[PDB]
């Protein structure tokens, strides 16, 4: 549950930390490992992986993945590129 | 961008020297002006 | 790796035998002249061996260093006992063998890793013609 | 082309260090058939296929200059006369 | 300094004498309008002569 989280978090899902696209990275929350103080903190912290799964998985999506083969500005062109290539070391 | 900016100097500099070769050649000596 | 690593072997036992069994004058003294920078090449390979065989005595090569060292030279062998194949083949002499080495510079010559070789083969080749 | 379509992103040099020693042998064949008249014939891929004093066709690089090239050999070859 | 473009279906603020021409809406609220038109006689100007 340790080195789960933080595979979890890196972006490679842990098997404790189920990934969702309606709840993200949540937490069993019906084991005996988890108790009402952590449990604040543990839903405090999957929040943060969930939006570095969507960022890494839309980075990956639209920098360097055609050679030049949508037409749309806001999914595709140089410039949305540019974003996502600002991302990573952001 | 990825052009020539001094590869077709050199070329483009010898391809009218070329040209003033040959239309000379034929003036000076094979007499084409006579005809 | 290792497998990657044996064919130069093959490939040095072809580059030697033509230096015995070319070596008549019915081949001539191109042939021998031939040879003779062939030799020269297998020198170079054993000066190599030399210098790795002191860092691997005090641990210092490994399979990974080797195999980038001896990726250089595994062309030069190919060429050379590719040659020795072909002009074996025809059974060549005179000035078969200085337009083969003549081909084969044309042939590779996007890298001229081995365009230097059939260069310095034909310079050595043509002295006796 | 692929240069002109991403000379931005980090993907940049990789296709430029690619593509400086892939035009080695092109520019060499340019540098016979202008400097001594020789055509040169790789397997069929050069850029000028093969009275009127004319034996080669022609009928991506700076089309400018292309055919000139075109004229440009068979001058030489009227100056071997 | 040439005016030339490398653009596949995008904009970089500008749209002899063939499509330059600068709109108000796709450059920037901070950049203004009197430096654009700057930019745009440079380019204009040096695809002619």
Same mark, same amino acid.
Not at chain 3, 20 to 47: C, D, P, W
Not at chain 3, 98 to 114: N, P, V
Not at chain 5, 29 to 46: D, N, Q
């Given at each position: 549950?340790?080195?789960?989280?933080?595979?979890?978090?890196?972006?490679?899902?842990?098997?404790?930390?189920?990934?969702?696209?309606?709840?993200?990275?949540?937490?069993?929350?019906?084991?005996?490992?988890?108790?009402?103080?952590?449990?604040?903190?543990?839903?405090?912290?999957?929040?943060?992986?969930?939006?570095?799964?969507?960022?890494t998985e839309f980075i990956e999506q639209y920098t360097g993945h055609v050679q030049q083969q949508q037409g749309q500005g806001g999914l595709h062109g140089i410039y949305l590129r540019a974003f996502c290539t600002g991302l990573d070391s952001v | 961008v990825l052009m020539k900016r001094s590869i077709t100097a050199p070329l483009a500099a010898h391809i009218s020297l070329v040209n003033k070769a040959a239309v000379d050649y034929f003036f000076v000596e094979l007499h084409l002006e006579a005809h | 790796l290792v497998h990657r690593i044996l064919p130069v072997a093959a490939s040095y036992s072809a580059v030697?035998?033509? +230096?015995?069994?070319?070596?008549?004058?019915?081949?001539?003294?191109?042939?021998?002249? =031939?040879? &003779?920078?062939?030799?020269?090449?297998?020198?170079?390979? =054993? +000066?190599?061996?030399? #210098?790795?065989?002191?860092?691997?005595? #005090?641990?210092? =090569?490994?399979?990974?260093?080797?195999?980038?060292? +001896? #990726?250089? &030279?595994?062309?030069?062998?190919? +060429? =050379?006992?590719?040659? &020795?194949?072909?002009?074996?083949?025809?059974?060549?002499?005179?000035?078969?063998?200085?337009?083969?080495?003549?081909?084969?510079?044309?042939?590779?010559?996007?890298?001229? #890793? &081995?365009?230097?070789?059939?260069?310095?083969?034909?310079?050595?080749?043509?002295?006796?013609? | 082309?692929?240069?002109?379509?991403?000379?931005?992103?980090?993907?940049?040099?990789?296709?430029?260090?690619?593509?400086?020693?892939?035009?080695?042998?092109?520019?060499? !064949?340019?540098?016979?058939?202008?400097?001594?008249?020789? !055509?040169?014939?790789?397997?069929?891929? !050069?850029?000028?296929?093969?009275?009127?004093?004319?034996?080669?066709?022609?009928?991506? !690089?700076?089309?400018?200059?292309?055919?000139?090239?075109?004229?440009?050999?068979?001058?030489?070859?009227?100056?071997?006369? | 300094?040439?005016?030339?473009?490398?653009?596949?279906?995008?904009?970089?603020?500008?749209?002899?004498?063939?499509?330059?021409?600068?709109?108000?809406?796709?450059?920037?609220?901070?950049?203004?309008?009197?430096?654009?038109?700057?930019?745009?006689?440079?380019?204009?100007?040096?695809?002619?002569?």
């Amino acid at each position: 549950m340790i080195h789960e989280l933080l595979l979890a978090l890196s972006g490679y899902p842990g098997s404790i930390f189920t990934w969702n696209k309606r709840s993200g990275l949540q937490v069993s929350q019906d084991f005996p490992f988890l108790h009402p103080s952590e449990t604040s903190v543990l839903n405090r912290l999957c929040r943060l992986g969930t939006d570095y799964i969507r960022f890494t998985e839309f980075i990956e999506q639209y920098t360097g993945h055609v050679q030049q083969q949508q037409g749309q500005g806001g999914l595709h062109g140089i410039y949305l590129r540019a974003f996502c290539t600002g991302l990573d070391s952001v | 961008v990825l052009m020539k900016r001094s590869i077709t100097a050199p070329l483009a500099a010898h391809i009218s020297l070329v040209n003033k070769a040959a239309v000379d050649y034929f003036f000076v000596e094979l007499h084409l002006e006579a005809h | 790796l290792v497998h990657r690593i044996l064919p130069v072997a093959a490939s040095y036992s072809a580059v030697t035998r033509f +230096i015995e069994e070319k070596s008549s004058f019915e081949y001539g003294q191109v042939n021998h002249a =031939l040879a &003779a920078a062939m030799r020269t090449l297998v020198k170079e390979h =054993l +000066i190599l061996v030399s #210098q790795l065989e002191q860092l691997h005595r #005090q641990g210092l =090569l490994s399979l990974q260093k080797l195999w980038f060292y +001896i #990726q250089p &030279a595994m062309r030069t062998m190919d +060429i =050379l006992a590719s040659l &020795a194949t072909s002009v074996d083949k025809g059974e060549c002499l005179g000035g078969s063998t200085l337009s083969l080495l003549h081909d084969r510079s044309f042939s590779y010559t996007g890298d001229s #890793q &081995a365009q230097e070789l059939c260069l310095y083969l034909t310079k050595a080749a043509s002295a006796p013609y | 082309q692929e240069a002109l379509h991403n000379c931005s992103n980090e993907h940049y040099p990789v296709l430029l260090s690619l593509l400086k020693t892939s035009c080695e042998p092109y520019t060499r !064949f340019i540098h016979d058939w202008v400097y001594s008249g020789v !055509f040169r014939d790789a397997y069929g891929e !050069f850029m000028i296929q093969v009275k009127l004093y004319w034996t080669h066709g022609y009928v991506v !690089f700076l089309k400018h200059i292309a055919h000139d090239i075109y004229v440009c050999g068979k001058t030489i070859n009227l100056l071997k006369l | 300094l040439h005016g030339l473009l490398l653009d596949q279906h995008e904009e970089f603020f500008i749209k002899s004498l063939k499509q330059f021409s600068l709109r108000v809406e796709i450059l920037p609220s901070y950049i203004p309008v009197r430096v654009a038109e700057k930019i745009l006689f440079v380019g204009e100007s040096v695809q002619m002569f």
